[PDB]
Amino acid sequence: MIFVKNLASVLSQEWSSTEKYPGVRWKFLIDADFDGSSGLSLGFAEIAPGGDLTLHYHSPAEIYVVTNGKGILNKSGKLETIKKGDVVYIAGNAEHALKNNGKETLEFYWIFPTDRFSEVEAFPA
Amino acid sequence: MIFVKNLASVLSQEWSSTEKYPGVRWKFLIDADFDGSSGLSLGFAEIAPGGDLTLHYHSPAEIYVVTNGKGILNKSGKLETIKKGDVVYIAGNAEHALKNNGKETLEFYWIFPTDRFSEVEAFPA
Numbered sequence: 001m002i003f004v005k006n007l008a009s010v011l012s013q014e015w016s017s018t019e020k021y022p023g024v025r026w027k028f029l030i031d032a033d034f035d036g037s038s039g040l041s042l043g044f045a046e047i048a049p050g051g052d053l054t055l056h057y058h059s060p061a062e063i064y065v066v067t068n069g070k071g072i073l074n075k076s077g078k079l080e081t082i083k084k085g086d087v088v089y090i091a092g093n094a095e096h097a098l099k100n101n102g103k104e105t106l107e108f109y110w111i112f113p114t115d116r117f118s119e120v121e122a123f124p125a
Numbered sequence: 126m127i128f129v130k131n132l133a134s135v136l137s138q139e140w141s142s143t144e145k146y147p148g149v150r151w152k153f154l155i156d157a158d159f160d161g162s163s164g165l166s167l168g169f170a171e172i173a174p175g176g177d178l179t180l181h182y183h184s185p186a187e188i189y190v191v192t193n194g195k196g197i198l199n200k201s202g203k204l205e206t207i208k209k210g211d212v213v214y215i216a217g218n219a220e221h222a223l224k225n226n227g228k229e230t231l232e233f234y235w236i237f238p239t240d241r242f243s244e245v246e247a248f249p250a
C-alpha cells in the first residue's frame with residue numbers, strides 16, 4: 001500500500017508519553033500497530049520547553065528529522081545543538097538524548113528501520 | 126557514530142541529478158557512501174515546477190517527508206495531493222511517482238531502510 005499521513009490524520013490517536021521522558025509526547029504516523037506498513041516506521045514527537053528525551057539506546061539505527069524549535073543533542077556524551085532543518089543519524093546502540101533548552105516547542109519525526117515502534121526496546125544509559 | 130546534517134553541512138557536495146528525472150535534484154545527508162552509516166539512509170530532494178519523479182518502483186520500503194511546496198503523489202494509479210507537513214509511506218515494490226504541479230519548489234526528504242542510496246535499484250513502471 002501507499003498512504004499519506006499528517007498530524008490531522010491521527011487526531012483520534014491520543015498523545016503517548018512516559019514518566020522517564022519528562023515533557024515529551026508523541027504519536028505514531030507510520031507504524032504496523034496502526035497501519036500494516038512495514039520496513040520503516042515513523043512517529044512525530046513534541047518536547048516542551050525544559051523537556052528531555054532522556055539518555056537511552058536501542059538496537060536499531062534511528063533518524064531524527066527536526067521540524068521546529070531547537071534543542072541539545074547528547075551524542076553519547078558530546079553535546080551538539082540542533083534546530084529546525086537538521087536531520088540526525090543515531091547508530092544502533094549509541095547512547096543519545098535530546099533536551100529542549102529553548103522557549104518554543106521542539107518538534108521532530110523519528111524513523112526506525114522496523115515495522116513498528118513496539119519492536120524497539122529502549123534501554124536507559 | 127552520531128551526527129547532524131543540514132543543507133549547510135553538505136554545501137561541498139554537488140547536487141545529483143539524472144536525465145531519468147527532469148527537474149529533480151538531490152543531495153545525500155545520511156548515507157554509507159558519505160558517512161559510513163548503516164541501517165537507514167536519507168536524502169534531500171527538490172522537484173522544480175513541472176518536474177516529475179517518474180512512476181517507478183524498488184524493493185525496499187520508502188518514506189517521504191515533505192518540507193515545502195505541494196505535489197501530486199501517484200499511488201499506483203490513484204493520485205493524491207501532498208504538501209508541507211505530510212509524510213508518505215511507500216510499500217516495497219509499490220509503483221509511485223511525484224509531480225510538482227505548483228509554482229514553488231517541492232522539497233522533501235526520502236528515507237530507505239538501506240545503508241546507502243546507491244544500492245537501491247529503481248525500475249520505471
Ligand SMILES: C[SH](C)CCC(=O)O
Pocket residue numbers: 026043045053062110122
Ligand atoms: C519520541 S519516543 C516515542 C522515543 C524516541 C527515541 O527513541 O529516539
Ligand SMILES: C[SH](C)CCC(=O)O
Pocket residue numbers: 149150151168170178187235247
Ligand atoms: C529523489 S531520488 C534520488 C529517488 C527517490 C525515490 O526512490 O523515490
Ligand SMILES: [Mn+2]
Pocket residue numbers: 056057058062096
Ligand atoms: Mn532513540
Ligand SMILES: [Mn+2]
Pocket residue numbers: 181183187221
Ligand atoms: Mn522511490
